[PDB]
Write a protein that binds this ligand. Structure first.
Ligand SMILES: *[C@@H]1O[C@H](CO)[C@@H](O[C@@H]2O[C@H](CO)[C@@H](O)[C@H](O)[C@H]2NC(C)=O)[C@H](O)[C@H]1NC(C)=O
Ligand SMILES: *[C@@H]1O[C@H](CO)[C@@H](O)[C@H](O)[C@H]1NC(C)=O
Ligand SMILES: *[C@@H]1O[C@H](CO)[C@@H](O)[C@H](O)[C@H]1NC(C)=O
Lengths: 49, 49, 73, 147, 49
């Protein structure tokens, strides 16, 4: 993942230590082949599987 | 699977072979349904009696 | 290349993801019908590994993760 | 496939085209490996020596004008395509016709052939999906490309 | 762009073949067949005509 740094005046002022990034999060889950039963709504959306 | 697709994308000579497998299979499917129906019909016939 | 300093090393935190990642398998649209498709999907109730880029002290981590046979982010 | 003998005949000679002789395992279908290495057989691996039991990855051609036509080089192009996966970008020379509604007609929509009365339908196709199907997986609705 | 692939300055060696993907274009396949300057035109799974 690419990252964002919330650089401010309070930081030292360099590329190695000057950063106050704060809160950030992500989840990674691997995918594998499986058989799924899909239910389709009258409109067309998949309500549940 | 689609009959039209084979007809549309294959040569007339080429269709002797591809269509034949489809036709043979479909007759067997029809044959199974008819045979099953007669057996089911008899049970109903017995029930009717 | 430029670097960053004072990072905290901790074991990964894992949290459950359930009934998520279901996606339309293909272009066709159907109504009021159930169709079973053998398409790669996140298995239901399969563990996902949480990661933190939050400083809340001196915490910042964006480690490389292998993408094998489909990855969900 | 075709011959271009004249193009492949040079006074100096041509040897910029190379085919592999040896490889440890068979190449996968529709997969190309251009890695420069030398095949190694059994013991005493050459490790770049290209010595006994070690071979350079590819061998040069012999295309020459004097060279016999039968064995002379052919230019071969393979055209491969798959269908019905998605809307097809590469349509043929066919010219379109005006849409007819509520009358039975023979319709070829994006390489799909069937026969039925066509009528406007209320179902909400989400922008992404081109076709439609019923409970028994038979085409029920379509979106005209122009329309 | 059928022409660029068919008539080109150079043809790649087998070890590293050249693959081109053609999209969003209308191409008349029949004209290639019409020319008949190519010795082998075997077509598999699709009728050339
Ligand atoms: C590809 O090369 C062929 C063969 O050289 C070209 O076919 C010729 O085109 C010219 C100009 O249109 C005609 O006057 C000739 O009669 C054609 N045949 C030959 C053998 O020259 C073709 O135009 C070229 N380009 C493509 C198909 O894009
Ligand atoms: C589904 O269609 C109905 C039609 O009555 C509509 O009321 C509803 O808002 C639609 N919902 C979605 C998610 O499209
Ligand atoms: C959950 O993740 C842990 C990681 O240690 C793993 O051992 C376990 O098999 C996973 N269980 C499920 C149900 O995904």
């Amino acid at each position: 993942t690419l990252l964002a740094l919330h650089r401010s005046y309070l930081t030292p002022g360099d590329s190695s230590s000057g950063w106050t990034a704060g809160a950030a999060a992500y989840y990674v889950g691997y995918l594998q082949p499986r058989t799924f039963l899909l239910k389709y709504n009258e409109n067309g959306t998949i309500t549940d599987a | 699977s689609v009959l039209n697709d084979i007809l549309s994308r294959l040569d007339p000579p080429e269709a002797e072979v591809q269509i034949d497998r489809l036709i043979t299979g479909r007759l067997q499917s029809l044959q199974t349904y008819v045979t099953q129906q007669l057996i089911r019909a008899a049970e109903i016939r017995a029930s009717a009696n | 290349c430029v670097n960053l300093t004072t990072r905290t090393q901790l074991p990964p935190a894992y949290t459950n993801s359930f009934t998520r990642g279901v996606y339309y398998p293909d272009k066709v649209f159907r109504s009021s019908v159930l169709h079973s498709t053998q398409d790669l999907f996140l298995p239901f109730f399969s563990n996902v590994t949480w990661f933190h880029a939050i400083h809340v002290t001196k915490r910042f981590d964006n480690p490389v993760l292998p993408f094998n046979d489909g990855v969900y982010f | 496939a075709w011959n271009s003998n004249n193009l492949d005949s040079k006074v100096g000679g041509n040897y910029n085209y190379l085919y592999r002789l040896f490889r440890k395992s068979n190449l996968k279908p529709f997969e190309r490996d251009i890695s420069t290495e030398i095949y190694q057989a059994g013991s005493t691996p050459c490790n770049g020596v290209e010595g006994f039991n070690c071979y350079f990855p590819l061998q040069s051609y012999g295309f020459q004008p004097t060279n016999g036509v039968g064995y002379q080089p052919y230019r071969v192009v393979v055209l491969s395509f798959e269908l019905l996966h998605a809307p097809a970008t590469v349509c043929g020379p066919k010219k379109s016709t005006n849409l007819v509604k509520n009358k039975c007609v023979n319709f070829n929509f994006n390489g799909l052939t069937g026969t039925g009365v066509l009528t406007e339908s209320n179902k909400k196709f989400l922008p992404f999906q081109q076709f439609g199907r019923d409970i028994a997986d038979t085409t029920d609705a379509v979106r005209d490309p122009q329309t | 762009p059928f022409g660029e692939v068919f008539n080109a300055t150079r043809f790649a060696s087998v070890y590293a073949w050249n693959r081109k993907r053609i999209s969003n274009c209308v191409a008349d396949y029949s004209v290639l067949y019409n020319s008949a300057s190519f010795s082998t035109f075997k077509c598999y799974g699709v009728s050339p005509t």
